[PDB]
Design a protein around this nucleic acid. Structure first.
Ligand SMILES: [Mn+2]
Lengths: 471, 273
DNA sequence: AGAGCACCGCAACCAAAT
RNA sequence: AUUUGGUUGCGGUGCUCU
């Protein structure tokens, strides 16, 4: 049986531009803030002119983080492989000023760090750790002028012992709890965007491994600090005017005996001239919904996209023109009917299912990897390179070989090239870091971040739809 | 973006130019912990005998329908139905039995090559023939040039010292893919398996460090050489990875699926094709 | 209580990238 | 947990059979 050989057809996608200050387009997020500035610099009074910063560190870590933020916000030089940091003062870089008030500084005293050794097991010890870290977020949230930003400079001995606690809890089985997911959820009920800053970053010596060069440690910290205090660093240019990008991702229940997979939402839409806004998961799924398989059933499919359109007709006041549901898993026929019967109020839809692949990986005979933006089609398999060598910077700022992003499933009114053009510009919107691009789109990266924190929310607390609290 | 240069890219999959197209069912079978009296090892040793026992059958490729069969003259005398690939292609359950027979087929192909299977991560790793000694294999390329690579080496420490007390066995991640209605692919994934002193694996945490320390500086020229080395090891010359069953053939054409893409050029590389 | 394929989640350590 | 890329290990789910 002479099998028909697969035809390998290929094309490359042009790199999108991001709208920086004065609506000036530039490719790299690092270089577009140095020349022009952040996007919200002239957009109005949304630009944070003064940022008030609090600390929940101990005595040594607060001083180390303060001298790091004073020797890091005034310009950091970089080599040829790391573009320099301009600064975070009122005349350099982001054109915003850091201000360390001494009234908004909590402090982990030594009588309390040793109070979390008295409980016997590992459950109550971690619970008391989350208890005082919640209490000293409360004491900052109840001041008459709460800080705009809270930097938890956690000590090393607390993170080493209570940062990752796994135990057995009778009816739940092996339970793994994390400190970071338990204090970004306690800072969300008090409305305080926080930033955990360990001693490996603030005390890092030059020419030392396991951390970046100080230019990238400046960039990835202060881009997140600029977004978390209000204002937007950059917005893309080549995107539609009515799309309602949804980023559904599945997540296990908390425990090794509870079998089930709940969902995580991420709306990514456009509000007037402000650019992309990232909303998601105003609610918590009821404990009786679940879903035995990895995918989702039909009443959940009808409720979920109904709440998606409810979020769209509350901030844009219109029905969405397009709804593009990115998802990690494939589309079963149970959930394909329910994302289509309940999308009858929307003109066009695009049920898209992407996932990085395992063994198939294109290579090149040169010394540098195959580029970012390729669209290799091995017959029916479609492989998109959201990571690779980038022609704008002429460098590969990663290691090993990039994984392809396999398009596992597609059904909708758009083509394959059109939605894989929109996916590559949705890739570049990770405001957590000042990197050029990542693997997954921000719809599937924010909703791997919201469902991991929904595992550490005590039910009655309603979660907040911002990208600030989940970053 | 100053000029467009056409390059040729190389994937890590091998096309399957010929497939077994008759799955001869065996619907009378003594269960799995008896099957050793297949006997009947052919005069042509090029014939391979895969088999599975699913639902009281003996699904195989060895032409079990007639009397003189290479497989199971006692277990399945003449009862067969000759199920085809064409009627099975629309059934998701029966395109799983076929690719599992193909997985056992390539497992039996890598038996003369002496690649041991881990049977847990689908990993065919080398091991040395004699304990305490290194294994370095000599292979013939497609173009005729003969080379030799260490595959079970124990690295001596760089500062003129004792060896680093972990053996770096070189492994492969073969898998089968459907690339069309009838287009197929054979994917090669290079890997490493790290042992203590040979023949005894490392733990779950130290292997994660020792594979990340090695496969982080293995950029897009020292992974392509491993893929080329693996197609040359599975080739052993005669550039078609072939397998015979008796009036059926599984022939893997060992040329990596190439293409041609036009992009703005990269300074300093200038790939020499 | 197992075998097999196909496809997913998530937890540890690395390394700053030719 | 400044950050992303990738590796490794563990487990889960769907389907079929014993
Ligand atoms: Mn962050």
């Amino acid at each position: 049986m002479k099998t028909n050989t697969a035809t390998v057809r290929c094309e490359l996608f042009e790199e999108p531009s991001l709208e920086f200050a004065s609506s000036r387009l530039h490719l790299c997020p690092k270089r577009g803030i140095t020349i022009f500035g952040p996007r919200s610099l002239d957009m109005g009074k949304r630009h944070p002119d003064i940022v008030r910063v609090g600390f929940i560190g101990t005595g040594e870590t607060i001083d180390s983080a303060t001298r790091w933020l004073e020797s890091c916000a005034d310009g950091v030089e970089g080599d040829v492989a790391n573009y320099r940091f301009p600064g975070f003062r009122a005349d350099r870089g982001f054109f915003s000023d850091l201000s360390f008030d001494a009234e908004t500084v909590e402090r982990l005293t030594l009588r309390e760090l040793e109070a979390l050794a008295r409980p016997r097991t590992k459950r109550e010890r971690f619970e008391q750790a989350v208890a005082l870290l919640d209490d000293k977020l409360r004491l900052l949230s109840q001041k008459d002028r709460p800080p705009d930003y809270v930097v938890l400079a956690l000590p090393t001995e607390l993170v080493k012992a209570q940062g990752r606690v796994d135990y057995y809890d009778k009816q739940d089985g092996e339970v793994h709890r994390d400190l970071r997911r338990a204090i970004k959820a306690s800072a969300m009920k008090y409305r305080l965007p926080t930033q955990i800053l360990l001693q490996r970053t603030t005390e890092a010596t030059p020419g030392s491994k396991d951390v970046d060069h100080l230019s990238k440690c400046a960039w990835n910290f202060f881009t997140g600090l600029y977004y978390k205090t209000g204002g937007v660093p950059w917005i893309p240019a080549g995107l539609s005017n009515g799309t309602c990008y949804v980023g559904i991702s599945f997540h296990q229940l908390l425990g090794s005996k509870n079998s089930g997979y709940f969902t995580g939402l991420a709306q990514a839409f456009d509000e007037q001239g402000n650019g992309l806004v990232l909303r998601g998961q105003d609610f918590v799924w009821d404990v009786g919904k679940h879903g035995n398989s990895a995918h989702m059933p039909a009443p959940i499919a009808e409720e979920l996209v109904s709440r998606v359109l409810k979020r769209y007709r509350d901030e844009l006041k219109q029905s969405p023109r397009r709804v593009v549901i990115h998802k990690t898993t494939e589309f079963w026929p149970e959930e394909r009917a329910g994302l289509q019967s309940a999308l009858s109020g929307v003109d066009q839809f695009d049920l898209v299912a992407v996932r990085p692949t395992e063994d198939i990986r294109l290579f090149r005979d040169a010394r540098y990897p195959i580029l970012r933006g390729s669209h290799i089609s091995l017959g029916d398999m479609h492989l998109l390179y959201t990571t690779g060598y980038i022609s704008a910077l002429q460098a590969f700022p990663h290691g090993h070989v990039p994984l392809p992003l396999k398009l596992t499933d597609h059904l909708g009114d758009s083509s394959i090239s059109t939605v894989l053009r929109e996916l590559m510009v949705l890739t570049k919107m990770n405001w957590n870091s000042a990197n050029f691009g990542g693997l997954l789109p921000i719809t599937l990266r924010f909703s791997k971040l919201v469902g991991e924190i929904m595992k550490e929310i005590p039910n009655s607390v309603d979660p907040l739809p911002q990208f600030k609290y989940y970053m | 973006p100053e000029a467009m240069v056409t390059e040729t890219v190389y994937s890590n999959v091998l096309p399957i130019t010929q497939l077994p197209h008759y799955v001869y069912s065996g619907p009378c079978t003594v269960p799995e912990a008896e099957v050793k009296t297949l006997i009947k090892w052919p005069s042509d040793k090029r014939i391979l005998t895969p088999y599975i026992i699913r639902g009281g059958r003996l699904y195989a490729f060895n032409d079990l329908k007639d009397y003189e069969s290479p497989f199971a003259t006692i277990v399945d005398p003449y009862s067969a139905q000759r199920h085809t690939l064409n009627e099975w292609l629309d059934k998701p359950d029966e395109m799983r039995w076929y690719v599992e027979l193909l997985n056992r087929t390539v497992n039996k192909i890598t038996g003369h090559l002496r690649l041991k299977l881990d049977k847990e991560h689908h990993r065919y790793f080398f091991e040395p023939d004699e304990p305490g000694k290194d294994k370095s294999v000599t292979y013939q390329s497609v173009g005729g040039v003969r080379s030799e690579r260490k595959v079970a080496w124990n690295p001596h420490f760089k500062h003129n010292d004792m060896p680093k007390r972990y053996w770096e066995h070189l492994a492969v991640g073969l898998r089968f893919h459907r690339l069309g209605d009838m287009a197929w692919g054979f994917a090669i994934r290079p890997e490493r398996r790290f042992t203590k002193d040979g023949f005894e694996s490392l733990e779950g945490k130290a292997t994660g460090k020792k594979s990340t320390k090695k496969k982080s500086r293995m950029y897009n020229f020292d992974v392509l050489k491993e893929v080329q080395f693996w197609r040359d090891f599975l080739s052993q010359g005669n550039p078609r990875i072939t397998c015979l069953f008796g009036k059926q053939a599984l022939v893997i054409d060992n040329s990596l699926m190439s293409a041609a893409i036009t992009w703005p050029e990269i300074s300093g590389d200038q790939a020499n094709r």
